[PDB]
Coordinates of C-alpha atoms in Angstrom, one line a residue:
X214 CA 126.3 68.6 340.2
X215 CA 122.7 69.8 339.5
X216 CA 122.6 73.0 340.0
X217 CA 125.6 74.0 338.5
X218 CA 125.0 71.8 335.1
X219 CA 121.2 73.9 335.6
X220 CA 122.3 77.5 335.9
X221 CA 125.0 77.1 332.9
X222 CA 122.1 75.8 331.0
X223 CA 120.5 79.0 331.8
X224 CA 123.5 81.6 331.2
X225 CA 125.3 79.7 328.3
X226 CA 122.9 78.7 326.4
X227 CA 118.6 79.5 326.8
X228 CA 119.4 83.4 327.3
X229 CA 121.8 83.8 324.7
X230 CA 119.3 82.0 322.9
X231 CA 116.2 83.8 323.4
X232 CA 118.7 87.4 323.0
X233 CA 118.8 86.9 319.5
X234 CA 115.0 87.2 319.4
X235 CA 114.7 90.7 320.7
X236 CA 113.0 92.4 317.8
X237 CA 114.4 96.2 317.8
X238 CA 112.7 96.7 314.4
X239 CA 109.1 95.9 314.3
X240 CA 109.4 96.0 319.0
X241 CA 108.8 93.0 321.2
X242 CA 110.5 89.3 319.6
X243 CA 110.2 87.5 316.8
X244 CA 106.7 85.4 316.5
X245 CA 107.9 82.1 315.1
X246 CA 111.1 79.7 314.9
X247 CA 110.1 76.7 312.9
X248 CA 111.6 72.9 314.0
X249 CA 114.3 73.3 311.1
X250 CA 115.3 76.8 312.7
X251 CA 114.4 78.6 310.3
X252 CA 113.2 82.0 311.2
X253 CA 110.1 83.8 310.5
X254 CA 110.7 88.0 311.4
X255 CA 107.2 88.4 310.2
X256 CA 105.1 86.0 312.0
X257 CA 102.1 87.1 314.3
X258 CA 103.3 87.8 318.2
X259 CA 101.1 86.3 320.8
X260 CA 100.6 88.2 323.9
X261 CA 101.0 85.0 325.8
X262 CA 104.4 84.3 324.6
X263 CA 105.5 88.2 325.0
X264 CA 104.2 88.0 328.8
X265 CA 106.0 84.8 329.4
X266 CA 109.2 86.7 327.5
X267 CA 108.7 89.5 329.8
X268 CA 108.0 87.5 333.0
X269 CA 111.3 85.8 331.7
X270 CA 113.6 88.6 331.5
X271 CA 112.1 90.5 334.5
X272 CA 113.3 87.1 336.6
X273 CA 116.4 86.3 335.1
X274 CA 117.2 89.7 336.0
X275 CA 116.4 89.3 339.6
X276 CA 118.5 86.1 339.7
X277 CA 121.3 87.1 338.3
X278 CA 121.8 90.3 337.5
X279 CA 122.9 91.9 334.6
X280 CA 121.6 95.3 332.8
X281 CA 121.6 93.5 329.5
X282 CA 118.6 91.2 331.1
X283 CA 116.9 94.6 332.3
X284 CA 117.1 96.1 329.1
X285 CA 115.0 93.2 327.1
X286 CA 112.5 92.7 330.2
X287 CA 111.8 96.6 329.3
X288 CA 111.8 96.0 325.6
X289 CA 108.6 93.0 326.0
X290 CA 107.2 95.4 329.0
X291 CA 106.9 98.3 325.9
X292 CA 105.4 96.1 323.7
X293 CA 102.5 94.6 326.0
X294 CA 101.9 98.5 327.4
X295 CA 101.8 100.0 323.6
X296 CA 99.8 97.4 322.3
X297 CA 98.8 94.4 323.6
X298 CA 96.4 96.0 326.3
X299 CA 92.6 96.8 325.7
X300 CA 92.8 100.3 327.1
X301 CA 89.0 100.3 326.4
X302 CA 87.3 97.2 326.6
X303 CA 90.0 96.3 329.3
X304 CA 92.0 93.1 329.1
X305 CA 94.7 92.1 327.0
X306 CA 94.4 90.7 323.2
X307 CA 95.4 87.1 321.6
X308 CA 97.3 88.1 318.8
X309 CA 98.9 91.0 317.0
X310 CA 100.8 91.1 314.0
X311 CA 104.3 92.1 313.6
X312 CA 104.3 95.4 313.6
X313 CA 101.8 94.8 317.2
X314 CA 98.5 95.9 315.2
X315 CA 95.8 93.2 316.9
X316 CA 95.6 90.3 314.8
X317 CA 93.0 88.4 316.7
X318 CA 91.0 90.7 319.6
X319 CA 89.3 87.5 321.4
X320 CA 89.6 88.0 325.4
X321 CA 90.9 85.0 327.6
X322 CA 90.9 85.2 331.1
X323 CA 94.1 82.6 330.8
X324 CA 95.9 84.9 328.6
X325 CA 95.0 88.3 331.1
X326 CA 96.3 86.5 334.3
X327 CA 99.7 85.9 332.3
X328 CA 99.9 89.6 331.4
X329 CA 99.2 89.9 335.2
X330 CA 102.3 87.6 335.8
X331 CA 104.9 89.0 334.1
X332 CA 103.5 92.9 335.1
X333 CA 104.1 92.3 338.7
X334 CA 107.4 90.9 338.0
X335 CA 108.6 93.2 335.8
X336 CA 107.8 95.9 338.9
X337 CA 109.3 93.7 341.3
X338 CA 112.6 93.8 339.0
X339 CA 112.6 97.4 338.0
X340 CA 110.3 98.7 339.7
X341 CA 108.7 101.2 337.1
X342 CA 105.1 101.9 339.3
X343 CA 103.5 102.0 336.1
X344 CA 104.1 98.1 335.7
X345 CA 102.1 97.5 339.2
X346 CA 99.5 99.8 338.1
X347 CA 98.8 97.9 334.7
X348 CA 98.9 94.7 336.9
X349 CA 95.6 96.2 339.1
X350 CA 94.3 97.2 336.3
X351 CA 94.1 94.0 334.9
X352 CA 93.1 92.6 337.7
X353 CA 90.5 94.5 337.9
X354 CA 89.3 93.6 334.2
X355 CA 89.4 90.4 335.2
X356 CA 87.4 90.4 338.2
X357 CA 84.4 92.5 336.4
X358 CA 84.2 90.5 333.3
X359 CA 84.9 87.3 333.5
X360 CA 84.0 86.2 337.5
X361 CA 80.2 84.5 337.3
X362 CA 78.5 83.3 340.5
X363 CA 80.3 79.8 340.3
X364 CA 83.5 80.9 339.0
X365 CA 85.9 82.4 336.1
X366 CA 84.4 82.2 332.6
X367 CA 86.9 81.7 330.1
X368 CA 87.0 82.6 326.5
X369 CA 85.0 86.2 325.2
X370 CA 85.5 88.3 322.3
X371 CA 87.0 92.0 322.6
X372 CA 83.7 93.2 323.9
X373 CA 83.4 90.8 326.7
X374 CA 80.5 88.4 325.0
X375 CA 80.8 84.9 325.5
X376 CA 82.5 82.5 322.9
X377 CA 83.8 78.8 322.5
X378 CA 86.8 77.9 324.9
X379 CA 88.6 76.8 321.6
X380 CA 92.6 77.3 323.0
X381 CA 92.7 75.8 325.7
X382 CA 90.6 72.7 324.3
X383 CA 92.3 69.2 324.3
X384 CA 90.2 67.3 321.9
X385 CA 87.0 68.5 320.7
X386 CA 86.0 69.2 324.0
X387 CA 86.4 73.0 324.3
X388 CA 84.6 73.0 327.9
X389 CA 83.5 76.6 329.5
X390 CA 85.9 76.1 332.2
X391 CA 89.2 74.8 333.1
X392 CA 91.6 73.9 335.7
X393 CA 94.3 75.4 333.6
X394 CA 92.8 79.4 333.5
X395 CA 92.5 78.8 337.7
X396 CA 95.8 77.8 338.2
X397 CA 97.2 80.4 336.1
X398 CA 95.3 82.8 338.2
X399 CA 96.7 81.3 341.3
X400 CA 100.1 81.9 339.4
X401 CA 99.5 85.4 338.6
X402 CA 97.6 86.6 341.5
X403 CA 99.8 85.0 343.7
X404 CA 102.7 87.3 342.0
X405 CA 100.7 90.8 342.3
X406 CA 100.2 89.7 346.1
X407 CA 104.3 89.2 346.4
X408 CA 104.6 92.1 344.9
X409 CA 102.2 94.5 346.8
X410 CA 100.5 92.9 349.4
X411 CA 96.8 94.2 348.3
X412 CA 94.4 91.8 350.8
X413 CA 91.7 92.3 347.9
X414 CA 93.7 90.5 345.8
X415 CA 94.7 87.8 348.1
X416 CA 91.0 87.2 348.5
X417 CA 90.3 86.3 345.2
X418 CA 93.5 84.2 345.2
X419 CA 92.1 82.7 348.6
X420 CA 89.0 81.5 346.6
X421 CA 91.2 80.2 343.7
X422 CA 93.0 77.6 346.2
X423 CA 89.5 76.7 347.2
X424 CA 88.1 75.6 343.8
X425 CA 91.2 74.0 343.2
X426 CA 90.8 71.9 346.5
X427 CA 87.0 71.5 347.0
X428 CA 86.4 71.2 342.9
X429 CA 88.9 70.4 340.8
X430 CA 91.4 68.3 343.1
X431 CA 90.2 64.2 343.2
X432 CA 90.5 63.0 346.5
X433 CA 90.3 59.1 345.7
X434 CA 92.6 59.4 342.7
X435 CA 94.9 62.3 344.0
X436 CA 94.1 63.6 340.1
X437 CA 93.3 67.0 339.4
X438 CA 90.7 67.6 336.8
X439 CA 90.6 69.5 333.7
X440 CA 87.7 70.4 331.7
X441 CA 84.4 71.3 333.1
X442 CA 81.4 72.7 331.7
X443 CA 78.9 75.4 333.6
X444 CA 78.1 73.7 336.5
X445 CA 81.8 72.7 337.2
X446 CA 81.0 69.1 336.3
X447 CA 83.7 66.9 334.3
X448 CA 83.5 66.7 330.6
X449 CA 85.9 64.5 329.2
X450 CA 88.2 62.7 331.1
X451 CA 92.0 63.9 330.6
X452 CA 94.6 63.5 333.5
X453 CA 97.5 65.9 332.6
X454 CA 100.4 64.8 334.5
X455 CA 102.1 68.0 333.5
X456 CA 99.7 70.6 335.2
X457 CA 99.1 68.3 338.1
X458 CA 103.0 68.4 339.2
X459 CA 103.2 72.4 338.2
X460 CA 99.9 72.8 340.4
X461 CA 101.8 71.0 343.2
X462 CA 104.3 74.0 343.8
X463 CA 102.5 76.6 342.2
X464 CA 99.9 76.1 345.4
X465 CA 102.5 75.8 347.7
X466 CA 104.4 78.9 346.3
X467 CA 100.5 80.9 347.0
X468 CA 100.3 79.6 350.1
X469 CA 104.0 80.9 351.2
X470 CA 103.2 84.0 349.7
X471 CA 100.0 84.5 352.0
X472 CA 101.8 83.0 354.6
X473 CA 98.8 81.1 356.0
X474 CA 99.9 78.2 358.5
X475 CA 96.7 76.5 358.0
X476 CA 96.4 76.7 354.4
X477 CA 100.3 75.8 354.2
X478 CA 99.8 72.7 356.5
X479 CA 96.7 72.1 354.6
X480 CA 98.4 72.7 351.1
X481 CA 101.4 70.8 351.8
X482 CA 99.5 67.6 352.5
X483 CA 97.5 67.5 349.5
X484 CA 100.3 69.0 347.0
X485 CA 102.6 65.8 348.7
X486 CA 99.9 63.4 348.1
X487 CA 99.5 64.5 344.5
X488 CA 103.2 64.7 343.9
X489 CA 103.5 61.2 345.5
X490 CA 100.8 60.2 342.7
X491 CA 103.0 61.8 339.6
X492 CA 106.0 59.9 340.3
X493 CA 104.3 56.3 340.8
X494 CA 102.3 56.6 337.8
X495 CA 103.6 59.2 335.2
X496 CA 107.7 58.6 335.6
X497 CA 108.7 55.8 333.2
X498 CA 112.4 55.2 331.9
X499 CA 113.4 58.4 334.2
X500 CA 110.7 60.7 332.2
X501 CA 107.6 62.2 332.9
X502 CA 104.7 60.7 330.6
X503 CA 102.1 63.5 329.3
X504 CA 98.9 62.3 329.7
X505 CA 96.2 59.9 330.1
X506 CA 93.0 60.9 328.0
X507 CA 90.5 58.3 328.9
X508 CA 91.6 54.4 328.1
X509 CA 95.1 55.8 326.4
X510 CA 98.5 57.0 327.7
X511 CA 100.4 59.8 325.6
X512 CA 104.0 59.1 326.5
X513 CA 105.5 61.6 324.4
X514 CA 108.2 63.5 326.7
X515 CA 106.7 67.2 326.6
X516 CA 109.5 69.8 327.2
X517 CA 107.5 71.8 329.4
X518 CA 106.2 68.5 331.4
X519 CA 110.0 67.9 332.3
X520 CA 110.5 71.3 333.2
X521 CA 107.9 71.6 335.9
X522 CA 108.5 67.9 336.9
X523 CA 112.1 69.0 337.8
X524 CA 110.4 72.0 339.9
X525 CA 107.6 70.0 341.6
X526 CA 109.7 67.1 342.7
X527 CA 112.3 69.1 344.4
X528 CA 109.2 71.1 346.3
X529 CA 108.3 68.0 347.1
X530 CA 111.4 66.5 348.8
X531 CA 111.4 70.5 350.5
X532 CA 108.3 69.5 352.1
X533 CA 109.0 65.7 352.9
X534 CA 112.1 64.9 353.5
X535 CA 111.8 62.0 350.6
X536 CA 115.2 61.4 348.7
X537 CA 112.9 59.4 346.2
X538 CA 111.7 63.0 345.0
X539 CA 115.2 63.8 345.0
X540 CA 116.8 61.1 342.5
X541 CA 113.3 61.6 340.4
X542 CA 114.0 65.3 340.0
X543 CA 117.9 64.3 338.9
X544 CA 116.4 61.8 336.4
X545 CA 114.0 64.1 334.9
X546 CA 117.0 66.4 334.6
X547 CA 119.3 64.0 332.9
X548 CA 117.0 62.9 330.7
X549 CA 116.5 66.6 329.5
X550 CA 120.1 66.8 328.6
X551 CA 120.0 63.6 326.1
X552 CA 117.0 63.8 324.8
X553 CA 115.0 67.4 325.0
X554 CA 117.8 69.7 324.4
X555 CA 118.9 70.6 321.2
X556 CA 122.7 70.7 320.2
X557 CA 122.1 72.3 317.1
X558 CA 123.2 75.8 316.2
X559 CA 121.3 78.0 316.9
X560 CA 118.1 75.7 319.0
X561 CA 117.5 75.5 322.4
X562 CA 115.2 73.0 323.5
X563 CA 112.7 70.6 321.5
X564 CA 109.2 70.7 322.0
X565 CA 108.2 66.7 322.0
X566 CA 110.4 64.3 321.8
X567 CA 108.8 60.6 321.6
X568 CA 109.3 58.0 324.9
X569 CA 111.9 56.7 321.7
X570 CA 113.5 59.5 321.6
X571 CA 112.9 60.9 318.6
X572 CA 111.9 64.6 318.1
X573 CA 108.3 65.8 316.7
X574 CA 109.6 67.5 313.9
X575 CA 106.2 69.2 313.2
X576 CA 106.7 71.0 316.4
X577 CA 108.1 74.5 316.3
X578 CA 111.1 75.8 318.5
X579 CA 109.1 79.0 319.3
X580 CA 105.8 80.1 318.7
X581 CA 102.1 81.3 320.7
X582 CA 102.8 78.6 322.4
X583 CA 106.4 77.6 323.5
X584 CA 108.8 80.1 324.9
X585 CA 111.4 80.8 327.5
X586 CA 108.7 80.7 330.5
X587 CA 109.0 76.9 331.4
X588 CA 112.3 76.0 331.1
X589 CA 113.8 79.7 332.6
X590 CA 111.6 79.1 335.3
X591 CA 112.8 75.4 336.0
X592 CA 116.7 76.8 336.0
X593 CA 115.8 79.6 338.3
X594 CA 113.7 77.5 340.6
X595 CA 116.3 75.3 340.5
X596 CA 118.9 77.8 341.6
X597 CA 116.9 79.9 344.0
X598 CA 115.9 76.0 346.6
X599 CA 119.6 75.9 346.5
X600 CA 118.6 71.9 347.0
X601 CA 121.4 69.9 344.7
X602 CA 122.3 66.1 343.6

């Protein structure tokens, strides 16, 4: 059934997949797998894509066991520690290099929280107490340079001074803040709190829910919004099915985590009517669509967008009862096994594949911004609800 197809997908073939990565030369993993698989050793390494390899690890590790899984966790962990942290300014960089010299230095408050992520993880798996200190200290950076009177800022230079949100920008719109940098902090913080149980920290995590329910959430629409400019207004007008249904268990996950009755109660009702939302408007031949930006509907199957649609629907039957949620989940699923994963040697899984079914061959296999983080969470999640169909 499910889960087994799901955890062999795991074991057999995305960790011996990202294995073959592990960079014992230069440290950390390779940078860049091109579409035609063929393999750059030399490429830049984003942070974001090393924290997402380490969160990776440091939770495959936890879920099944298995030095070997260890051992790579704590080969990403020294590459972040040695050089991916701004021991000075604070934070963590964009970009190094491949020998880990900083390539670009820009600050991102997205990027940080990630670093966060896979930190208190990587403690929670090992638990080297030097992880959970980086984690605070992070935190802290966080906290002291990017939190304004109405909310995170978003995009800085090394030294903290205020730059174009370029990155996390859709279109041109590059907006000062997003709905993506306060999830991720939900993700993150919601992590360090798991791990330690600091109340500061659930504070700012407390505050993070809020925005997400009194700002960013649409209450007429169950949409959640995405770009916003200083005064949290809307600036464009992009519905991202993908981060809506991640949001919808990510904020249930937080609330668990804080173990709140009102906020889960309170949570659980909006999360379910968002979730009931995703699957009435953005499942379509048994796929999650991407997008709507403004009058026009992206349908291209984004591997990531499957992922968490597999995750999100499951939560949702958890807190409804709904087989509908159920059979979506399944479909999403089975639809990832024709279409999104690659049966070449050596691939794993395709970026984009169109609603035709044909893959984006412009898209790389693994770069800054696709990695084992998604899909490894999706199998694990998967595993650990112990629902199956």
């Amino acid at each position: 059934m499910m889960i087994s197809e799901i955890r062999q997908e795991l074991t057999d073939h995305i960790i011996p997949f990202w294995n073959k990565l592990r960079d014992d030369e230069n440290g950390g993993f390779y940078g860049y797998l091109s579409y035609g698989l063929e393999l750059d050793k030399k490429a830049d390494k984003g942070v974001i894509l090393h924290s997402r390899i380490l969160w990776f690890y440091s939770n495959a590790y936890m879920t099944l066991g298995g030095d070997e899984l260890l051992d790579n966790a704590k080969h990403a962990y020294e590459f972040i520690k040695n050089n991916c942290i701004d021991y000075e300014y604070g934070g963590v960089y964009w970009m190094m290099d491949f020998e880990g010299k900083p390539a670009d230095t820009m600050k991102h408050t997205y990027n940080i929280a990630f670093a966060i992520y896979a930190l208190s993880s990587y403690y929670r798996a090992s638990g080297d107490k030097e992880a959970l200190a980086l984690a605070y200290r992070l935190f802290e950076d966080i906290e002291k340079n990017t939190l304004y009177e109405y909310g995170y800022r978003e995009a800085f230079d090394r030294q903290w001074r205020l730059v174009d949100n370029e990155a996390l920008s859709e279109n041109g719109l590059k907006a000062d803040k997003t709905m993506n940098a306060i999830l991720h902090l939900i993700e993150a913080y919601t992590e360090l709190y798991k791990a330690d149980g600091n109340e500061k920290v659930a504070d700012r995590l407390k505050f993070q829910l809020g925005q997400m329910r009194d700002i960013v959430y649409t209450p007429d629409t169950n949409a959640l919004k995405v770009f916003f400019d200083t005064a949290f207004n809307l600036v464009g007008d992009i519905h991202s099915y993908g981060h809506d249904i991640e949001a919808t268990w990510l904020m249930d996950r937080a609330c668990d985590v804080l173990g709140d009755e009102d906020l889960k109660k309170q949570f659980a009702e909006m999360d379910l009517k968002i979730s009931h939302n995703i699957q009435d408007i953005a499942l379509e031949d048994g796929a999650l669509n991407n997008e709507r930006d403004k009058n026009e509907i992206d349908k291209t199957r984004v591997w990531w967008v499957q992922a968490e649609a597999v995750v999100g629907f499951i939560n949702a039957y958890q807190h409804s009862g709904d087989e509908k949620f159920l059979e979506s989940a399944k479909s999403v699923w089975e639809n990832i096994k024709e279409y999104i994963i690659d049966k070449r040697e050596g691939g794993e899984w395709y970026s984009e594949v169109t609603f035709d079914h044909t893959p984006h061959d412009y898209k790389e296999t693994v770069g800054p911004w696709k990695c084992p983080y998604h899909n490894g969470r999706m199998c694990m999640e998967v595993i650990t609800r112990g629902v199956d169909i």
